[PDB]
Amino acid sequence: TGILITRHSQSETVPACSAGHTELWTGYSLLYVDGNDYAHNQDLGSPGSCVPRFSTLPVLSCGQNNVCNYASRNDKTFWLTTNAAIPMMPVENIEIRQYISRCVVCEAPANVIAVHSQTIEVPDCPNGWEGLWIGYSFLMHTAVGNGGGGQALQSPGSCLEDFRATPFIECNGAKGTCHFYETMTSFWMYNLESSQPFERPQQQTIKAGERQSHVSRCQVCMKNSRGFIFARHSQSVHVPQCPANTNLLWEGYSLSGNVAASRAVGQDLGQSGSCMMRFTTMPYMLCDITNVCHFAQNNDDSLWLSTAEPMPMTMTPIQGRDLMKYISRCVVCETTTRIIALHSQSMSIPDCPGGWEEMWTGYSYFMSTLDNVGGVGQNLVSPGSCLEEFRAQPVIECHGHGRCNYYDALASFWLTVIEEQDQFVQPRQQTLKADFTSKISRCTVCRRRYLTGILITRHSQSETVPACSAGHTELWTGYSLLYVDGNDYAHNQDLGSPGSCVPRFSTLPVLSCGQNNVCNYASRNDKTFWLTTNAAIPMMPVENIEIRQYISRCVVCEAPANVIAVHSQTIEVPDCPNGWEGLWIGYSFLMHTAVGNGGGGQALQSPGSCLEDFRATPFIECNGAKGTCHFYETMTSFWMYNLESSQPFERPQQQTIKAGERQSHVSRCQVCMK
Amino acid sequence: LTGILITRHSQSETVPACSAGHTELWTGYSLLYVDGNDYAHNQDLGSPGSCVPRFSTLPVLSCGQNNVCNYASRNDKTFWLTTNAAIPMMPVENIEIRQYISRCVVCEAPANVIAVHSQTIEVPDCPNGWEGLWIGYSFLMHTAVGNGGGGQALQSPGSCLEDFRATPFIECNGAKGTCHFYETMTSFWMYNLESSQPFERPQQQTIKAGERQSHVSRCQVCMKNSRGFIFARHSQSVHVPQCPANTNLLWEGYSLSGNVAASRAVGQDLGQSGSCMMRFTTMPYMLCDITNVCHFAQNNDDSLWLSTAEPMPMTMTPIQGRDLMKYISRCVVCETTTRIIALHSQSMSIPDCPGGWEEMWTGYSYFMSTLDNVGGVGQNLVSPGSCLEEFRAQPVIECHGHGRCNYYDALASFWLTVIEEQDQFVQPRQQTLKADFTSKISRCTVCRRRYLTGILITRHSQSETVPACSAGHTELWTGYSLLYVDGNDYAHNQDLGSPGSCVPRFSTLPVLSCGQNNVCNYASRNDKTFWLTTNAAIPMMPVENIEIRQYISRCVVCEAPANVIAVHSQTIEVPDCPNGWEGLWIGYSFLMHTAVGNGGGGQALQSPGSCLEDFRATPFIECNGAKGTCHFYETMTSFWMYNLESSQPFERPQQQTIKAGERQSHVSRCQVCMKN
Ligand SMILES: [Cl-]
Ligand SMILES: [Cl-]
Ligand SMILES: [Cl-]
Ligand SMILES: [Cl-]
Ligand SMILES: [Mg+2]
Ligand SMILES: [Mg+2]
């Protein structure tokens, strides 16, 4: 059954699958798209980072007035690059090919993960796992400023076989050229060998041939049970225990994320990338285009889940071995079946679906935000969105300097209780003490008790609740959540994830918590964004029960096998891979931008990247505390472009596409099940 | 005539003309801002820097640390005020651009010129003794996409556009040589508050087509008929402050710190009249979109007000309604015959005014406020707005379209700290203060000149030796060349032509941060500072202690007898000074900079700070605040005005990689000029 692994060559060569592993397609290694000044990344370990047809601009931009614009602004694409020497001038048409990494997508017989030693040692695979390749721990990237992204440390995409200081190239979309720029920065996990635990990082500048001995090593491992894994966090100084019917792989320290070059990139707390075997206030170094790397020389941060230990009365930063009292511990566990989280949005703890068993219960944790670096958020189907201890301040901030503290702008967001009758009523402002756990949505983490436990999410893009495919089991129905804009950070749910299908609607489904153990509901200026229906656009915002005709409905279904989207990048519907069968066809939906810092995007292998109805404005903006929703000219949708008339490295030609011609310029897709 | 300059934009293809006896200095094209390396650097539409003599879709060059500059090689943008021409269906190129670029003129005026805003449908009268030059609509902010954009100073004539347009600017893709209008472009205009009580909830509205004009605040641009320099003064209390001696009251109002629209905070300098609004409201503006619809208080935007010492309610719930009166600081706007400056001691000593200057008030050195994911609002350190009479850990309160205000945890303040002489070039000592804050806050004095009007000039040596004043100029102080502070990941700059960029005492951390619960923190987090650097050689690794001084540019602040501007040739030729002006120095046209993270900033093109005497591809250094070490990084970019000598105006820029050995020959030149 179709567990899918993606391999990147970091060269002009197309990589190969192993024997036994069936090749699904080959392509070009896509890192991220910069659309309307918003960076939307693909996971390098996922099939969505392997794009069959190259273009410097494989996307189309669509606005609120039935006009789409191709290659009409200043959007960029970023691709993993090769070992070719850095050119003096930007490269154009077929010379580009020498600089774009190639990739292959393969079906593996069992789960595949990356493990990281955080040292010069190559880490071993866990018992019952075997190595596929070894490499270097690739953590984050920025092209310029804080525009960039980062990898999940559980993902094979965080383990690149070739260490390169500049591992990606930047393409000017409409100019059709690609180049390297001095601001391009890579961030790699650092070799912590023999470092003094909890003491100040020993700053280093490293050059040329000595760089590699300072990079953390990794191995990508496949299970020989299909070997699904997850993390569990104690939120205390005590190491937690793996739940019944799961086996301990390793213990560690709870990594929430990293803030490099003023961009926070989180590690999902359900994944093994949130459980580091070695704690440090600075887990990574930066590497520049002149083959110099700097460790703890400038001003970057790490974020760790914390304990309930109080700040000292002096409120001075914590340093030295005192830090041990403040950092949460974790374990990584292996299970024969998949793990999910369910959120009630009520005081009721949700029950596990029929056929599943409860691993733990907790509180619905949505995101943490920071000042002027964005934030770090959880997938609402991940166990990381279900923390067993409610905390106003669940995350502590640490610096290259070697100290950590709670700083005032650190905020947390949790799903709130929404009584059924209150869904379409204006949120009522409330300030609460952080021991009032009765205002916080409850959650349950479940493993499947043979079906491995795959969930499919479908969005109707209408007022009608959609049905599961025949033979699939309906688990719940809900409303199509796209993202929450909280303290001016946009945290998305992928539309293929059950986390985008929330059972209860509200213009404000979250509350925020801050310092002094105080939480606030509907007390500031937050907003939420939902996939919308086919209803006519209103002349002014809609309010309370009128909102219901503009919110897409959804259903979450349990399916016997894996599901992916495939994209033709042409006007034709793509066939499913050999051995897979189609569930629905649609239009290739990549990313979106909106007012302020608003934006997000879909994984290209996710069913969320395949919407059945093409809509230039597929989502609506809800004013959180006002209880009203509306469409705005600041909303943009990005779809994969129909490249049928283009050569791979041909420069995009500007096109303004009007009315009924828009759909003919949009890539088609099919959602397929093994 | 001392060389006071007024800038007018026609919002049309026709070049505008100067008033009666006003002498024309030059004409040009109306530059709004430049988006370089994903950083927006704006020109003040009321200043000569917004009037650029030679158009290009990309009039700038990008230079890096590794011996290469790039022209038209990335995805940089320019934004220009536009005309009344109909919006095209697709981007326009080459000569088709011309009909869409507003023209401008720079004129010499005999006296000070300001904008006054009614915040109503009524055109405000000029203050007694002032004469109107034009009337218009109150233009506050703009965004092109996301939170990239900027805003006007409400004292500036640039906040008073004669023609109201929902889309008053056009966007040019630098390297493609095309310009266009995009659906995400938004303008923000001050709102007509005629039918509303000040502390009642904003009554949200959606306004269509023909009714939009009647909801826009009106303004008049006024010239003094004394030259009538003005300043604001804030009480930080509900009491209306008094105008100091030898100054006269123009109006009283409420202390506006800034606005946060589409997730971009744009401050009003607290020394300028734009920080003193006649009418308070939690939502002073509306947004207007490209489809001729405006929305007032329908979505989620903010205003920022200087606050009183009134305690938050113990419940910590937001404040609403009549209760808001207790929290909003009051202000006055005063006129004076001479100019106003602030001096900062960086110590517990209160500084004395220079010889020939008289003290108006004393206070504490206020640098900036930061907010979460919208940036921050900062003060010019020579402005009286950088000298607040009362220290406050939380000097600013945040207000919403909803009609409520509160302090929120992410709202932080930054103050200049005490730096002893012996603390310079030493690693900062961490300190968390729960009491005795004033032991670590710099003191300041606001002075007016006692005839010379008190014009101050700043020179940067780009060396470790202090530069000299031009003869006839009086030296007031010397210092170190501060470019910007990166605090809570907001970059707040000092213009290199402002005396605020000349800091008497160096530290890798010259500020401390204060926040909720009345706690201040020095060297406690991860802040950093950027200084103009020297001619010294690039180090192989970060420098420390006795090595840092050779890398920090020195500066001098001098009093000049007449006004001083930079002029730019936009060619390899050194430009002549205007008729009746004489040159002080020559140099290279320095527009903006970007660095790690959210780091960046830029110079006003009429400021001497836009004219550096030495070209350096990496003209500044990055100091790690708490570590006390400084270094150069590949993330540092400098932007210079480009040599357009052989470019036709609407010609498409040609990509060029420019290697060391010819970088200087592609850089516009400048001369800094003083009125005779
Ligand atoms: Cl584009
Ligand atoms: Cl809110
Ligand atoms: Cl460019
Ligand atoms: Cl610091
Ligand atoms: Mg906001
Ligand atoms: Mg930072």
Residue numbers in the entry:
A (entry chain A): 4 to 227, 1003 to 1227, 2002 to 2226
B (entry chain D): 3 to 227, 1003 to 1227, 2002 to 2227
The article reads:
Collagen IV is an essential structural protein in all metazoans. It provides a scaffold for the assembly of basement membranes, a specialized form of extracellular matrix, which anchors and signals cells and provides microscale tensile strength. Scaffolds are composed of α-chains that coassemble into triple-helical protomers of distinct chain compositions, which in turn oligomerize into supramolecular scaffolds. We solved the crystal structure of the NC1 hexamer, determined the chain composition of protomers, and found that Drosophila adapted an evolutionarily unique mechanism of scaffold assembly that requires divalent cations.
To overcome this problem, we recombinantly produced FLAG-tagged single-chain NC1 trimers with specific hetero-compositions CVC and VCV using the same design as in transgenic analysis but without a fluorescent protein. Thus, the CVC composition of NC1 was able to spontaneously form a hexamer although this process was highly inefficient. Moreover, once assembled the CVC hexamer was not dependent on chloride pressure, thus confirming the Cl- independent mechanism of stability. We were able to obtain diffracting crystals of tissue-extracted NC1 hexamer (at 2.98 Å resolution) and CVC trimer (at 1.75 Å resolution) and solved their atomic structures. We solved the crystal structures of tissue-extracted and recombinant NC1 hexamers and found that the tissue-extracted complex is indeed a heterotrimer of the same composition as the recombinant CVC single-chain construct. Instead, two magnesium ions were found at the trimer–trimer interface. Collectively, unlike in mammals Drosophila NC1 hexamer interface is stabilized by four Cl- and two Mg2+ ions.
